[PDB]
Design an enzyme around this catalytic site. Structure first.
Site, PDB file in Angstrom:
ATOM      1  N   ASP A  10      14.722   6.936 -27.713  1.00 29.07           N
ATOM      2  CA  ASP A  10      15.487   5.815 -27.147  1.00 29.07           C
ATOM      3  C   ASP A  10      16.961   6.001 -27.437  1.00 29.07           C
ATOM      4  O   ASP A  10      17.647   5.089 -27.911  1.00 29.07           O
ATOM      5  CB  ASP A  10      14.950   4.516 -27.728  1.00 29.07           C
ATOM      6  CG  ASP A  10      15.345   3.280 -26.924  1.00 29.07           C
ATOM      7  OD1 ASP A  10      15.760   3.399 -25.751  1.00 29.07           O
ATOM      8  OD2 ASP A  10      15.222   2.183 -27.515  1.00 29.07           O
TER       9      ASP A  10
HETATM   10  C1  LIG Z   1      25.778   2.013 -21.467  1.00 34.26           C
HETATM   11  C2  LIG Z   1      25.491   0.545 -21.862  1.00 34.26           C
HETATM   12  C3  LIG Z   1      24.267   0.033 -21.241  1.00 34.26           C
HETATM   13  O1  LIG Z   1      23.275   0.918 -21.695  1.00 34.26           O
HETATM   14  C4  LIG Z   1      22.289   1.567 -20.838  1.00 34.26           C
HETATM   15  O2  LIG Z   1      22.617   1.691 -19.674  1.00 34.26           O
HETATM   16  C5  LIG Z   1      21.374   2.534 -21.513  1.00 34.26           C
HETATM   17  C6  LIG Z   1      21.764   3.926 -21.183  1.00 34.26           C
HETATM   18  C7  LIG Z   1      19.997   2.084 -21.261  1.00 34.26           C
HETATM   19  O3  LIG Z   1      19.164   3.230 -21.336  1.00 34.26           O
HETATM   20  C8  LIG Z   1      18.761   3.859 -20.140  1.00 34.26           C
HETATM   21  C9  LIG Z   1      18.448   5.250 -20.452  1.00 34.26           C
HETATM   22  C10 LIG Z   1      17.047   5.409 -21.106  1.00 34.26           C
HETATM   23  C11 LIG Z   1      16.741   6.771 -21.261  1.00 34.26           C
HETATM   24  O4  LIG Z   1      16.953   4.998 -22.321  1.00 34.26           O
HETATM   25  C12 LIG Z   1      17.801   5.424 -23.463  1.00 34.26           C
HETATM   26  C13 LIG Z   1      16.075   4.813 -20.319  1.00 34.26           C
HETATM   27  O5  LIG Z   1      14.843   4.908 -20.886  1.00 34.26           O
HETATM   28  C14 LIG Z   1      16.474   3.435 -20.185  1.00 34.26           C
HETATM   29  C15 LIG Z   1      15.475   2.597 -19.400  1.00 34.26           C
HETATM   30  O6  LIG Z   1      17.705   3.193 -19.566  1.00 34.26           O
HETATM   31  C16 LIG Z   1      19.494   1.009 -22.110  1.00 34.26           C
HETATM   32  C17 LIG Z   1      19.225   1.562 -23.464  1.00 34.26           C
HETATM   33  C18 LIG Z   1      18.407   0.282 -21.607  1.00 34.26           C
HETATM   34  O7  LIG Z   1      17.625  -0.154 -22.610  1.00 34.26           O
HETATM   35  C19 LIG Z   1      16.267   0.422 -22.866  1.00 34.26           C
HETATM   36  O8  LIG Z   1      15.425  -0.038 -21.891  1.00 34.26           O
HETATM   37  C20 LIG Z   1      14.170   0.411 -22.203  1.00 34.26           C
HETATM   38  C21 LIG Z   1      13.411  -0.049 -21.023  1.00 34.26           C
HETATM   39  C22 LIG Z   1      13.608   0.011 -23.469  1.00 34.26           C
HETATM   40  C23 LIG Z   1      14.477   0.623 -24.448  1.00 34.26           C
HETATM   41  N1  LIG Z   1      14.029   0.289 -25.710  1.00 34.26           N
HETATM   42  C24 LIG Z   1      14.164  -1.089 -26.204  1.00 34.26           C
HETATM   43  C25 LIG Z   1      12.685   0.909 -25.969  1.00 34.26           C
HETATM   44  C26 LIG Z   1      15.773   0.124 -24.213  1.00 34.26           C
HETATM   45  O9  LIG Z   1      16.644   0.687 -25.167  1.00 34.26           O
HETATM   46  C27 LIG Z   1      18.867  -0.986 -20.871  1.00 34.26           C
HETATM   47  C28 LIG Z   1      17.792  -1.334 -20.007  1.00 34.26           C
HETATM   48  O10 LIG Z   1      19.826  -0.704 -20.064  1.00 34.26           O
HETATM   49  C29 LIG Z   1      19.345  -2.081 -21.715  1.00 34.26           C
HETATM   50  C30 LIG Z   1      19.791  -3.296 -20.956  1.00 34.26           C
HETATM   51  C31 LIG Z   1      19.703  -4.335 -21.836  1.00 34.26           C
HETATM   52  C32 LIG Z   1      21.073  -3.237 -20.361  1.00 34.26           C
HETATM   53  O11 LIG Z   1      21.129  -3.633 -19.185  1.00 34.26           O
HETATM   54  C33 LIG Z   1      22.261  -2.956 -21.100  1.00 34.26           C
HETATM   55  C34 LIG Z   1      23.129  -4.141 -20.926  1.00 34.26           C
HETATM   56  C35 LIG Z   1      22.832  -1.760 -20.720  1.00 34.26           C
HETATM   57  O12 LIG Z   1      23.394  -1.819 -19.446  1.00 34.26           O
HETATM   58  C36 LIG Z   1      23.932  -1.223 -21.582  1.00 34.26           C
HETATM   59  C37 LIG Z   1      23.844  -1.443 -22.962  1.00 34.26           C
HETATM   60  O13 LIG Z   1      24.993  -1.983 -21.394  1.00 34.26           O
END
Ligand SMILES: CC[C@H]1OC(=O)[C@H](C)[C@@H](O[C@H]2C[C@@](C)(OC)[C@@H](O)[C@H](C)O2)[C@H](C)[C@@H](O[C@@H]2O[C@H](C)C[C@H](N(C)C)[C@H]2O)[C@](C)(O)C[C@@H](C)C(=O)[C@H](C)[C@@H](O)[C@]1(C)O
Ligand SMILES: Nc1nc2c(ncn2[C@@H]2O[C@H](COP(=O)(O)OP(=O)(O)O)[C@@H](O)[C@H]2O)c(=O)[nH]1
Length: 300
Positions: free
Chosen positions: A199
């Site tokens: 993650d």
């Molecule tokens: C840049 C800043 C943004 O980060 C992301 O774009 C990164 C890059 C995502 O990872 C991307 C990339 C990746 C690979 O994860 C690292 C992928 O799996 C996910 C779905 O999206 C994250 C972290 C995702 O979370 C993950 O979602 C998963 C479903 C569960 C996971 N966890 C709790 C188990 C969790 O961390 C998720 C959905 O965007 C979180 C929600 C809350 C957001 O909308 C928030 C506001 C994000 O926009 C962010 C923080 O602002």
């Protein structure tokens, strides 16, 4: 008095049952679906993070993650949480005081700040930290009881996730075909697995004030699996240019690569839509589900 979001009495009692005496300022993040997160001051004058499992199904994951972190501690040139308390009702560790590489206010959809694209110290140190993590011996992961996926198992897991989404949602035809073509594209897939964070993105990386990687947090998805899992978010945040720099330094640092690695990472990032949709489904949260359904139905 003043109504406050934290129930200080209950928190004090919970901590004290596990040898931790809370005293002084605290802050509370209740937005997590599985854990309540409290950063609290303790009588050692230090801040500690209290990770409080919400339900029995979450509690069950504590002991295996504890074994992961126990194994990783001496095997990484950066800090990870030191779970001095680890049980079904409470995880607690001294706060790693360095900032995350992105700062965001609880509830917000938009970060206040992300470590800059042109931070060479961050880019280079993230790449070497990632090579270090992926160099942890598989034997150490096995001895620690980690979830192990061979390359075949890694690819099967992706197939299974895709198929679960297909059963539960209606997916854009081209999106679905993208995933299926990827799953069928032998050259894309690695012929080895590594210890992955699972993650990993800027929000789970700690940096010192020079922007050098100093730690990583939230290891609940760690396992032995496809290395590209830990590179997808770097591509999302820093683009193809950032990914290119990552891969050059990662390889120079001893990270194992393969010719179609960059391509594979892009496909893994696309596959993030599946991960999100399954999280939404498993959460039962109507807002997350709305977002997931919309994304899935949309052409990419
Ligand atoms: C840049 C800043 C943004 O980060 C992301 O774009 C990164 C890059 C995502 O990872 C991307 C990339 C990746 C690979 O994860 C690292 C992928 O799996 C996910 C779905 O999206 C994250 C972290 C995702 O979370 C993950 O979602 C998963 C479903 C569960 C996971 N966890 C709790 C188990 C969790 O961390 C998720 C959905 O965007 C979180 C929600 C809350 C957001 O909308 C928030 C506001 C994000 O926009 C962010 C923080 O602002
Ligand atoms: N700087 C810092 N932040 C932390 C630490 N532990 C937790 N956090 C913050 O608390 C947030 C939620 O903790 P986390 O373990 O990710 O909860 P989870 O997402 O439910 O697994 C993280 O995203 C960090 O912002 C730490 O040791 N240092």
């Amino acid at each position: 008095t003043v109504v406050t979001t934290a129930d200080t009495s209950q928190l004090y009692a919970l901590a004290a049952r596990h040898g931790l005496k809370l005293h002084g300022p605290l802050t509370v993040n209740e937005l997590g679906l599985d854990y309540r997160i409290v950063i609290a001051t303790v009588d050692d004058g230090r801040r500690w993070v209290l990770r409080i499992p919400r339900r029995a199904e979450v509690s069950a994951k504590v002991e295996p993650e504890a074994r992961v972190l126990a194994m990783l501690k001496n095997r990484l040139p950066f800090a990870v949480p030191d779970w001095r308390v680890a049980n079904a009702e409470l995880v607690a560790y001294p706060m790693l005081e360095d900032s995350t590489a992105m700062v965001i206010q609880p509830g917000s959809s938009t970060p206040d700040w992300v470590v800059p694209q042109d931070s060479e110290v961050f880019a280079e140190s993230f790449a070497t930290a990632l090579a270090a993590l992926h160099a942890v011996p598989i034997s150490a992961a096995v001895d620690a009881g980690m979830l192990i996926r061979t390359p075949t198992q890694a690819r099967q897991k992706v197939a299974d996730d895709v198929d679960r989404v297909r059963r539960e949602f209606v997916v854009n035809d081209k999106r679905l075909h993208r995933w299926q073509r990827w799953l069928d594209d032998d050259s894309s897939w690695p012929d080895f697995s590594v210890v992955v964070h699972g993650d990993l993105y800027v929000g789970h990386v700690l940096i010192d004030n020079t922007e050098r990687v100093s730690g990583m947090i939230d290891w609940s998805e760690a396992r032995v699996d496809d290395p590209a899992i830990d590179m997808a978010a770097h591509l999302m945040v820093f683009g193809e240019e950032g990914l290119a720099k990552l891969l050059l330094t990662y390889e120079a640092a001893g990270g194992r690569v393969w010719p179609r690695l960059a391509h594979h990472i892009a496909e893994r990032l696309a596959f993030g839509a599946v991960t999100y949709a399954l999280f939404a489904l498993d959460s039962g949260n109507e807002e997350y589900l709305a977002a997931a359904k919309a994304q899935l139905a949309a052409a990419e």
